[PDB]
Amino acid sequence: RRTYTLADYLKNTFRVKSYSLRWVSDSEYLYKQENNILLFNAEHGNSSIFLENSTFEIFGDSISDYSVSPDRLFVLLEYNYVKQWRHSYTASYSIYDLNKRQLITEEKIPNNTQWITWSQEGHKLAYVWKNDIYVKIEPHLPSHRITSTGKENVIFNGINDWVYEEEIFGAYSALWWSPNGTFLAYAQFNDTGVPLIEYSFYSDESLQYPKTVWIPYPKAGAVNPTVKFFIVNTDSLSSTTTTIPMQITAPASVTTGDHYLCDVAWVSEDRISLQWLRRIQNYSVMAICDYDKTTLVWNCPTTQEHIETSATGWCGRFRPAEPHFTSDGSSFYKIVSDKDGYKHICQFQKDRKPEQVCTFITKGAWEVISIEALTSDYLYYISNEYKEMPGGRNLYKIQLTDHTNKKCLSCDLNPERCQYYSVSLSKEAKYYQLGCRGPGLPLYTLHRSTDQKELRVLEDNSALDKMLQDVQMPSKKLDFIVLNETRFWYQMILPPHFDKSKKYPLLIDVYAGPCSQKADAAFRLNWATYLASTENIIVASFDGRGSGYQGDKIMHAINKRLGTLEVEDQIEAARQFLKMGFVDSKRVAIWGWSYGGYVTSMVLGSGSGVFKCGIAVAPVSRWEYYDSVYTERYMGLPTPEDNLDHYRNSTVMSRAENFKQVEYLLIHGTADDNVHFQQSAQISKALVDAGVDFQAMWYTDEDHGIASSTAHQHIYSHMSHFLQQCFSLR
Amino acid sequence: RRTYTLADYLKNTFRVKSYSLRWVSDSEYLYKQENNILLFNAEHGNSSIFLENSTFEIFGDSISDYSVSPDRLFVLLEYNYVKQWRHSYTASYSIYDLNKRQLITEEKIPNNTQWITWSQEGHKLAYVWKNDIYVKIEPHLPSHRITSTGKENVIFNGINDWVYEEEIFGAYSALWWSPNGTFLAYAQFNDTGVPLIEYSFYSDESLQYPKTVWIPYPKAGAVNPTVKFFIVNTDSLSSTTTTIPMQITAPASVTTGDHYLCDVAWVSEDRISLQWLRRIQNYSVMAICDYDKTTLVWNCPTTQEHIETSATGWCGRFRPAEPHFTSDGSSFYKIVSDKDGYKHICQFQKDRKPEQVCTFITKGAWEVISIEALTSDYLYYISNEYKEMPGGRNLYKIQLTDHTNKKCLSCDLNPERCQYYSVSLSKEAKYYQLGCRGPGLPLYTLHRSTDQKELRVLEDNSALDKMLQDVQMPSKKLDFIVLNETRFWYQMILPPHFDKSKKYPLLIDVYAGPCSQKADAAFRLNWATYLASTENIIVASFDGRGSGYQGDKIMHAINKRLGTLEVEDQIEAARQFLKMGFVDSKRVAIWGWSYGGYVTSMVLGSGSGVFKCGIAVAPVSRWEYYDSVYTERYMGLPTPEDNLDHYRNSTVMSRAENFKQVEYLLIHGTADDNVHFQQSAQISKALVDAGVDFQAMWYTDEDHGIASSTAHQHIYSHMSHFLQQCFSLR
Numbered sequence A, B: 001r002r003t004y005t006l007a008d009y010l011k012n013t014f015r016v017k018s019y020s021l022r023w024v025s026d027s028e029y030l031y032k033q034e035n036n037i038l039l040f041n042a043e044h045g046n047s048s049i050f051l052e053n054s055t056f057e058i059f060g061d062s063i064s065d066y067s068v069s070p071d072r073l074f075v076l077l078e079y080n081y082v083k084q085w086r087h088s089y090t091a092s093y094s095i096y097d098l099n100k101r102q103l104i105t106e107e108k109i110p111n112n113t114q115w116i117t118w119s120q121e122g123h124k125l126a127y128v129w130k131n132d133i134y135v136k137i138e139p140h141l142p143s144h145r146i147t148s149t150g151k152e153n154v155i156f157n158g159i160n161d162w163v164y165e166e167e168i169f170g171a172y173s174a175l176w177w178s179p180n181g182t183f184l185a186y187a188q189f190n191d192t193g194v195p196l197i198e199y200s201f202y203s204d205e206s207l208q209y210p211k212t213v214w215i216p217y218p219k220a221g222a223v224n225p226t227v228k229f230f231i232v233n234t235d236s237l238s239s240t241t242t243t244i245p246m247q248i249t250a251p252a253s254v255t256t257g258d259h260y261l262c263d264v265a266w267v268s269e270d271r272i273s274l275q276w277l278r279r280i281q282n283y284s285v286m287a288i289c290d291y292d293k294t295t296l297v298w299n300c301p302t303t304q305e306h307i308e309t310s311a312t313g314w315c316g317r318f319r320p321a322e323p324h325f326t327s328d329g330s331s332f333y334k335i336v337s338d339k340d341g342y343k344h345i346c347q348f349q350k351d352r353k354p355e356q357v358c359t360f361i362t363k364g365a366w367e368v369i370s371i372e373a374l375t376s377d378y379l380y381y382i383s384n385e386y387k388e389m390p391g392g393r394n395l396y397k398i399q400l401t402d403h404t405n406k407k408c409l410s411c412d413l414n415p416e417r418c419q420y421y422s423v424s425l426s427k428e429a430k431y432y433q434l435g436c437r438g439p440g441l442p443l444y445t446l447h448r449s450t451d452q453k454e455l456r457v458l459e460d461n462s463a464l465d466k467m468l469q470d471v472q473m474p475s476k477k478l479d480f481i482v483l484n485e486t487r488f489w490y491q492m493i494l495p496p497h498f499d500k501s502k503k504y505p506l507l508i509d510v511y512a513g514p515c516s517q518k519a520d521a522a523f524r525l526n527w528a529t530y531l532a533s534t535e536n537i538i539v540a541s542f543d544g545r546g547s548g549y550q551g552d553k554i555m556h557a558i559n560k561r562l563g564t565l566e567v568e569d570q571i572e573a574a575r576q577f578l579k580m581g582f583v584d585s586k587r588v589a590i591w592g593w594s595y596g597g598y599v600t601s602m603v604l605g606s607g608s609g610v611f612k613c614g615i616a617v618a619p620v621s622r623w624e625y626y627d628s629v630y631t632e633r634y635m636g637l638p639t640p641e642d643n644l645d646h647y648r649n650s651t652v653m654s655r656a657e658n659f660k661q662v663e664y665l666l667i668h669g670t671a672d673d674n675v676h677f678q679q680s681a682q683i684s685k686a687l688v689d690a691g692v693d694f695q696a697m698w699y700t701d702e703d704h705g706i707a708s709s710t711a712h713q714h715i716y717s718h719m720s721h722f723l724q725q726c727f728s729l730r
């Protein structure tokens, strides 16, 4: 008879478990249990201690993470983790020798490393420190410095500058070991002409004068950083004081103007795959380069060029998809849009072919989410094909020799509980583990790939289940509405004993950025759960135009003009929800974070009269303020020669007037390096000039995520009270 | 039957007039009428046009201000006024030749002048541009550059750096023409070791990357700017390419460590008065320097040193008072504390005298506010002696030859309407104009000094009076309560038909900084007027310890420990108001700006239970964040060797917990160069860490005054709604 309190959410009262394993081979995996890394044998539950409750304690309680060398001989112990940006951070490291049973203490690794990684083979280490790359052929041996051009906020060797880390790679690392570890490829970035953004950091109240953080950040249209790709021969390190890395230069069709390095992918140890993109992500080129043993040079013949294009928008979902080469790198499978605009899997031959470079191996009005593995005879992938549910996720399997032999491996399993699967195959797909994120409580099981026999259940949230028994959980409808003759999915978090006859207040949850998906079949315990279970508020999300994985027709619909259709469609969907009867039209709200805050604001300022109040957290107010790689992908360049008009037209401040008809709560982090605060500061000023009263809230020194513990609780409590006040509740 | 709306306040519906004249001689004055400067004759209303509706229009509508040369031959026309800090700003200028009847166009004055001024005599001009001083013996003639060391944020010649402009001189100007204009004295400041504060400026939404403003600003304990005083011979300018200014060096008893230049005052043209202060404003020295015609040097013999001291706190109210020399500079009158700690007027002889340098010419448990004029036989001053009201202001007069011959000149006049006078005597006190700011509507009259005959009434707000007839104005009680056997005045803005039997909600208006005075007899039409006349809220202020003009016992009571007594006494006074019966104890609030916001916050965080809600605008959160000259005057140095403990003890964040028992609204300007925002950012963070919900509001690009038009209206509307919500009104 107890409800799901905001405290339950903020204090993470009801923990949801999972089974994050690490395939160490084609048949064994590592698993952390009671702070003990155990080696498990897929097949027979056969287990065994790998690292003990012990070890980890030497480095006290600061052991941030661990990385086992592929040959399982050493373990990297991360500690002193200091975050910086979405994925970047610096730590301290120690190499533990499993065999000799103790910490290597000789040629230690610098106490402020920005990135480190094992080779794919033995115990080779490559790490970036002070923006320069270093290599240690073996843990006990000394470091060999690979670069020295490294310089803060200027030259990045082996790590990404701000925009690359955020918009292109989504990772800090810019290193790539070749298979067998002979070479080490890396990218270099020059942030020289890139302009700076500078925000204040107050720190402990003891700091008398606030700090100033500056970051080379390119806003739409600004000068971007530049790139260079190198591959260095890791073997010759012992015979020189300095090795000379060879450089690969981007293809001619990309060099005429600004461009980016899209993706890196080693094919074999004498072949590497590189994808390049033009600043106007209209065009993309994936070159395949071969190592010339004679002239000790890499060649990227235009015969193996391969061009990807888009006349509807940009390339790929957020960037060209990654290639998956056959064992002998003669061919590769890659997800690309078919004639109908549906992201599917098709085959390529190393050498390009005149307007027939592909052969689609998948067809349908659904899309392939990702290629999970490629055996010598099978291609395992994940799609949203089943039951025509774009919001669902299932694991499939096609036989290379026979494209008709296509079988779903999770569709049957638990149709009730599971409709959203995540996968994880062993080193050679002998076994696989399924992650049911599906409708019901998450369920983890592993199966033998041959016959799919479910060897055993790794984790079923029985524990959680027992607890949620004494609690009044809300439900989640996941259906679709049809507009202009097209299906448009949505979801709703209905409060407990939801009576379709009564009328509840509605809260629209938004994001709606290009290729986003807020309506899916995944189980979650968030603030929306609290809102329905205790405030009796229906929280609903709607994936409209410019969204999800439903073909380019729908996604590219927003091209060159954000702050348009995705905004309208959000309003339209609310109307449709009202027509569904059980919504108290006199109490409808809308909120969102980042892109979501933008749309919230764009909706509240639409004067549509449909919404009472709204909350925007770290919203974008006008695209010229946001970074280049992201903005330009959908908006082009903010110049009169391109899309300047649409830029200036989609401003939030341009709608300050319409805010008089709404209660608005603007929240922004003070140290937000992603969405600059400048954005909200610009919005509040616009409303002040418009004589529109509203509520604001800044979070001192908080990130783009406002995710520090106290801040996290504070911001949700404050928003809760805002809704309570707005919905006449409390 | 109509009330005084917030709109009346924000739109300045009911204008209050005045009569700001400019004595051009001992018998004529200038006055702006219908954008026409008219010359009036004191005695017979005899008027006459000086400058027409015309002239001013050439420079369109940007004519910011005008300055008439003392010999009335030329007029300085200011336009293109660009503010910067409390008093600083840059403009463009034009000199209009009254005689030749047209704008001088030859040797124009630089289009970005930081400061300019006529000599006290003819048409000599001295102006600062690019931090260097220039002189033009006559308008048509070319400029003679006096300094060249001038450099932005580093070397200031003739203008004050940030802290001097704000805390010492309260003006941008650091130039002083000698009488007869032979010399031009000026101060120079080196901001070299002074640290910088840097805030962001967003500007129009069109600016893609926000600006960063940096200002050398010394926070408590930091390295201060340094000073140097020079006097240059303005006569020799025509015979050199460069003149060499002579420098005066501060007295020995001030040079051992950090110090400041207190005040400058020309005695005659061969004698100048300079006041110096030690960084620890415990000690002050006023040297009198004489010009040596032989060795062409200025001498400041220690025989004419004159020392001012304080064993209770600091010197003067906000700094040593200014000297007023006799015609022959043999003696001077200066306001100083007497044996009982009461600021009174006493005589000094050029040469100091061993522990008898003074002879008080005034006694009493009241204080002399200021010395208005010194005739060869009379000394006109202003005090709060009458009716024992420290909150009142009257004009007095003592005969030098007979100190018994002391007569009040405004006490009788209009005891009902006027109790707060401002004065303005002609060049030689032949006539004088009185400014009744008193209880009733302001009244301006001028009298002939001889017999005090009121020649005529310059302005009585009959116009305003007629309008306030159809409006329900609140009243203002100004009385005192007695604590620990001492009188402590307060005031109340009682709503219209105020019934002493009913119970109204109470709003405490605070400032309470050292030597402040919120309870006085001056007429005002502010937000407090709206609050009483329309919301029926009683707005009251209370001058407690460390306040007003009631002797050093009361003012110095707060020495070395701010955030103490002045805070408590504010709570005590609220209790006393509650005991007065007509206050609805269940709805008592408190608000304040700058120092006032500090106390509001210190009170709300006192957990005294006496207040429901409170609003703090641009508050100070801990004294180490505020500037040196101000903070140290009352707090000493933030070192363990001095007062570090009291600094750390009087923090607002140190009381975050007690805020759970109160609704708090924190407002701060984004471009506040005075109270750095860092202060509020530090407060909000403290509350967030304490898990205390509250309301915040930033004002993009607003000053310390948040006084831009739209911001002004927005911030008061927002505060009004906050109180309405808090007082269950609205």
Ligand SMILES: *C(N)[C@@H]1CC[C@H](C#CC)N1C(=O)[C@@H](N)C1CCCC1
Pocket (backbone or CB within 6 Å): B166, B167, B318, B513, B514, B516, B593, B594, B595, B596, B620, B626, B630, B674, B675
């Ligand atoms: C706000 N008014 C800030 C807070 C501290 C200091 C005070 C007081 C009273 N202050 C000031 O702006 C200074 N500059 C003072 C100087 C005299 C009135 C304003």
